[PDB]
Design a protein around this ligand. Structure first.
Ligand SMILES: NCCCCNCCCNC(=O)CNC(=O)[C@H](CS)NC(=O)CCC(N)C(=O)O
Length: 185
């Protein structure tokens, strides 16, 4: 909806979300040129303006941590540590599959496996708010249109809480949510 790089709004903590609609520019030039590389004070955030770039920038700006570089977003679910940028300390990161008895929390990484709408890249978003039966998430490269005034999330997902288990339902019908990740030993 909005041209590539357009500010669409902000996620909690004042983290910018940009349109990543690269349907008007050279694809090869898109993956090779350094102008598509996002940084914050020499710290590499990711590729403009993919889902991984946003997730890493959000953690960096709000928690002072980052997860390692990955080729595909679904690979984040296999990571087991976060790195504290200020001193390079390593912190444990745990993965909780969808339907887990461990409830997600605000600020948690939500990972999608490759499949359906997220073909072979999968996806990653940040869970921003938890409610009775829904969670609000913030993400890049899904919504490319400006967000409503005061709205600091991109999508709302239904959350089913049954028999002590938490299951998130995506807005898409052909996708697969791997689960969420929280900083813990
Ligand atoms: N025409 C159909 C378009 C379908 C678009 N679906 C977008 C789904 C949103 N998910 C993503 O953006 C996840 N993208 C990715 O996983 C891409 C693969 S190039 N990987 C990265 O951005 C990571 C690059 C990296 N090395 C890093 O560490 O930051």
């Amino acid at each position: 909806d909005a041209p590539f790089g357009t500010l669409l709004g902000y996620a909690p903590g004042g983290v910018a979300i940009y349109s990543s609609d690269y349907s008007s520019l050279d694809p090869q030039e898109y993956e090779d040129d350094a102008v598509f590389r996002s940084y914050i004070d020499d710290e590499y955030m990711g590729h403009k303006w993919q889902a991984v770039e946003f997730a890493r920038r959000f953690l960096f700006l709000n928690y002072g941590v980052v997860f390692t570089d990955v080729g595909m977003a679904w690979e984040i679910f296999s990571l087991r540590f976060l790195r504290e940028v200020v001193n390079d300390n390593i912190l444990p990161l745990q993965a909780f599959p969808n339907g887990s008895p461990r409830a997600p929390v605000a600020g948690a990484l939500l990972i999608w496996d490759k499949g359906g709408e997220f073909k072979d890249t999968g996806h990653v978003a940040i869970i921003t708010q938890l409610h009775g039966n829904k969670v609000r998430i913030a993400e890049q490269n899904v919504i490319h249109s400006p967000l409503p005034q005061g709205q600091q999330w991109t999508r709302e997902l239904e959350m089913v809480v049954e028999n002590g288990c938490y299951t998130l339902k995506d807005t898409f019908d052909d996708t697969t949510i791997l689960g969420w990740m929280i900083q813990t030993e």
